[PDB]
Design a protein around this ligand. Structure first.
Ligand SMILES: [Ca+2]
Ligand SMILES: [Ca+2]
Ligand SMILES: [Cl-]
Ligand SMILES: [Cl-]
Ligand SMILES: [Zn+2]
Ligand SMILES: [Zn+2]
Lengths: 163, 158
């Protein structure tokens, strides 16, 4: 079973440069081609897992309800279009917290690291940061660095369905 | 000449809010199932897309433009980022009691198009969308999420 463990901010949707929080609907913007390309990936046999660091989500620096609105709408869009994430894995912690679950730590994905849980050879972490790539290393799998110009959703869709 | 799909907004591309028929809040925005992949499938088959919508009283105290713009611009962001392009977005903002020239099924918003008539369509969920197709001299598909939906239409037209 091949899995794509996919980052949220800066990968599925744009990352706001001011505070790095999609905490209003006008800061919500899908990355180009993400929907058709995730559809294409699913049709090739990949299951999808969302994995995101959301610094201080739940607290007053990032109120749950400020996150929920655009997140839920993002999820309705995916679901309604046929894109299904098996899980959405979120670390709401601050880096100072030194929590167990903050990417590139593997705690959130521990069940996929069980011994026949996935096909490590053909599974990927897709994300736009070094920490996504480090997560992949920590997981014993491939890391793809999403880039809107140089490794984008159409390129990814093509590359991962190559035979 | 050119194949067009004249596509209704509320109830056809996006969900129609059941109590007040206005998508005037972000939390009332939802996409109709499969609308994105099917419109992309339709584009690849040579259909050009035009959005056509009655937005009763858009700009009045009951439907302020700023209330419309937010969810609408977001919907547009989503479509465009995913490769779906509407050549135009044609809006009648009037109340029915105004009896304007532009409220579907009247043909005014679309005069300019009045294209390959035999392969062109109005797609919408109301009898008024079907009447628009008749008034325009083209085909009408009565969208229904359950019974004549986006995957069916994508398949039918390709
Ligand atoms: Ca990111
Ligand atoms: Ca309608
Ligand atoms: Cl992250
Ligand atoms: Cl209408
Ligand atoms: Zn954590
Ligand atoms: Zn009008």
């Amino acid at each position: 079973q091949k899995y794509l463990f996919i980052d949220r901010d800066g990968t599925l949707i744009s990352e706001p440069p001011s505070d790095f929080q999609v905490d209003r609907f006008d800061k919500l913007a899908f990355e180009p081609g993400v929907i058709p390309q995730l559809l294409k990936l699913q049709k090739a046999g990949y299951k999808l897992v969302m994995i995101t660091n959301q610094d201080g989500l739940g607290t007053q620096s990032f109120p749950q309800a400020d996150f929920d609105g655009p997140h839920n709408l993002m999820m309705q869009i995916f679901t309604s279009q046929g894109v299904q994430f098996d899980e959405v894995l979120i670390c709401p912690h601050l880096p100072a917290d030194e929590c167990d679950c903050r990417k590139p730590k593997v705690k959130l994905v521990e069940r996929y690291l069980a011994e026949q849980a996935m096909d490590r050879a053909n599974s990927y972490v897709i994300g736009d940061r070094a920490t996504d790539i480090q997560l992949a290393e920590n997981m014993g799998i491939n890391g793809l660095r999403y880039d809107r110009e140089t490794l984008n959703w159409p390129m990814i869709g093509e590359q991962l369905t190559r035979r």
